């Protein structure tokens, strides 16, 4: 899913760039995951990115 950010509680906008979990495919903004830039997001994606529940369950 994309058209809701459960981290922000759904005040969705297209202006902030996004990243997704490799397992769940759910999208979230860079800022609600403390990622600074599009390049930091590309680095985080190349590292094999994870959503909020995937931190305890399957991190990296």
């Amino acid at each position: 899913s994309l058209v809701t950010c459960p981290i922000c509680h759904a005040p969705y906008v297209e202006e902030d760039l996004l990243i997704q979990c490799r397992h769940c495919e759910r999208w979230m903004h860079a800022g609600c995951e403390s990622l600074f830039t599009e390049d930091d997001v590309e680095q985080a994606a190349d590292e094999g990115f994870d959503c909020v529940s995937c931190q305890p369950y399957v991190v990296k």
Binding site: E15, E25, V41, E42
Partner: peptide, 8 residues
């Protein structure tokens, strides 16, 4: 999707 996304 492609891990990263930006509109536009």
């Amino acid at each position: 999707k492609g891990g990263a996304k930006r509109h536009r």
